[PDB]
Structure formats: C-alpha cells, structure tokens
A = this chain, B = another copy of it.
C-alpha cells in the first residue's frame, strides 16, 4: 500500500522554514452537510450515504499538482492499516476506532487528508513541513471552497458552521504546530510556558505518551478560540507565539552549550551510543534518546546522522509500524526487542552512507 509504506511522505520530508524546531504545521476545518443528522445522532445508513456522496464527487478526482484523491474506506481497512494511518498523522484515533463507516480522502502527495464521518461529517486537513501556517491556511481555504461546490455546508449567519463539537463552534478551524523543545524541557521552562500560553488563548499537548506526558519532547501548540475571531487572525496569533517559542528554545540551547559544554556533548553521544547498540529499549527511553540525538545533530555535535531520524523513528517505532516491521503481532516483551533492533538497523544504515 502506497500510503502505508512510508512513515513520512516525500511532501513532508521537504525542508520548511524553521524546520530544526518546527516539525510541521496543520490546518483543520470541520463542517457538517445539510440534511444529514450530526455524527452524534445519525444512522449507519446516513453515514454510508455521506461516504457515497463524497465518492461520487471526488474519488479519483484530480487536484492539480497534489495528484488525484484516493478514498480509503474504514469499512474496507484492516485494524493494522488504520493504526498506521493514525501513526502517520493522516487520520485521528477517533476515525480509526469509533467511525465504522468513516473514510479518508487522501491526495496522492499526502499533503491533504479529508476525514469523513469523524466527529463532524467533514474534517479537512492540510499538512506542511516546518512553520508554514499562512501557506497551510491558504491551501485549506482554497480546498474548502472547492469542496463546497459539490456539497452544501450547514452554516448559520450568527453561529457559523454548525457542529456538535463545542471546541469547533464558529469557524470550525483548528490550527496547530508540532515543535521539538528539548532545551526548554531540560531547563524546566515548560511548566512556566504552558500556563502563560493558555492565557494568550492557545493550548499545548504532548504528541506522544499518556496524560501530561510529551515523549520525545515533542509538543503540539494549537488555538483555543474558534468563534468571534477571523481565521486569519486566529492563525496570525498562533504564528506570533510560535515564533516566540522558537527564539526561547534557541536561546535555551545556546545557554546550555555555554553552561554545560563537554557535558552536553557527552549527554547526546551517550544517547546515540545506547540507540546504536542496545538490544532492549522501551518507548519512554527510546523517545528521550531520540530527542537527545536530534539536539546533538542540531547543535553540530553529532555528524553523519540525518536529523530526520527523530521524525521518522518516532513514527516507525509506534505499535502499528512496529508490527509491520516485525511481520506479525508482537507480545509486550518482543516489542522492546523489535524496537531496539529497528533503531539499531537505521543508525547502522546511516553510518554506511
């Protein structure tokens, strides 16, 4: 399967602005279709009719340089295929786990993922590498008007796009950035920054882990406000705070180099040595060591290792990709052995080059 082969698409592997700290930018637009009940209330026959509506209008349809759209029906996917789409960030856990007649319209280049029958009938997602919030909003807005030519959105003049989701009321817009902030975590500035960010109207969560955890020091920053503010203003305010976070993380990295010197070089190389040689490693230690190694690459200590090892190995070591790597279902202890072996082989391949 084309979409299931790779952890990160060619599109997302491009270098974008500030790609050392900002992994990616995302615009999501939620809408519901007139004359169908909300997903909270509709029947499976209604869900099927929505999928059939989108198939009629868009399957195999060209979208210019993005290629044609492919329709992936949740009713036709194995659970492991669904899990891989989640780990690639192409579909949500809600779509994979809770939408039996869900679907995803995927552009051939994997820039565009339109979820069908999630918490709203439609969730338009546009993904860009690095910090490209303006470009992703323009792409999502153009796609939004293009879809609206074939489907009729439920829209109210005062309340905006109708939805059952309190966090989508109004614009239906969620803008977010994925950021690697190892220096702010190590200097313990995060527990100060998060409450400050909430005051400015933004939300922070960890991409990986459980609860308040942010394994690999990878964080997602998004807007909280969706009603009473223009989409452009929502995105411009996020962009401002993100650029402030980039400068604080860069400042913290230079402070660590000055304060720790050879001790920091020792820390990132020890993590490299563990990843390159261990035979058993759990998810928490692997993510931490991968974060350390990326920091070492960014700062220039670690040479001859592509920085994309963080992006790619964080995804490839998730349970679905790990089962695919191993060729079959894995028990708990085999998982830690397979995880170490996958990382070892990748780092060995980096040395050969």
A59: CB under 8 A from chain B? Answer: no
The interface residues of chain B lying within 8 Å CB-to-CB of A274 are 270, 273-274
Residue in A265, A273, A337 whose Cβ sees the most chain B Cβ within 10 Å: A273
Q: Is the interface of A mostly helix, strand, loop or mixed?
A: helix
Is A272's CB under 8 angstroms from B277's CB?
Answer: yes
The interface residues of chain B lying within 8 Å CB-to-CB of A280 are 262-263, 266
Give CA–CA (A270, B277) in the complex, Å.
Answer: 6
In chain B, what residue has the closest Cβ to A337? B262
Tally chain A residues at the interface, Cβ within 8 Å: 17
Residues in A31-50 with C-beta less than 8 Å from chain B = none
Residue in A266, A274, A276 whose Cβ sees the most chain B Cβ within 10 Å: A266
A329: CB under 8 A from chain B? Answer: no
The interface residues of chain B lying within 8 Å CB-to-CB of A275 are 273
The interface residues of chain B lying within 8 Å CB-to-CB of A273 are 270, 272-278
Give CA–CA (A315, B166) in the complex, Å.
Answer: 69
Give CA–CA (A120, B26) in the complex, Å.
Answer: 82
Give CA–CA (A272, B279) in the complex, Å.
Answer: 12
A290: CB under 8 A from chain B? Answer: no
A235: CB under 8 A from chain B? Answer: no
Further contacts, 7 of them, CB under 8 A, given A266-B279, A266-B280, A272-B277: A262-B337, A266-B340, A269-B277, A269-B279, A270-B277, A273-B276, A276-B277
8 contacts between A and B (CB under 8 A): A262-B279, A262-B337, A266-B280, A270-B274, A273-B275, A273-B276, A273-B277, A274-B274
* Complex A-B, nearest 3 residue pairs according to Cβ-Cβ distance, in ascending order: A273-B273, A273-B277, A266-B279
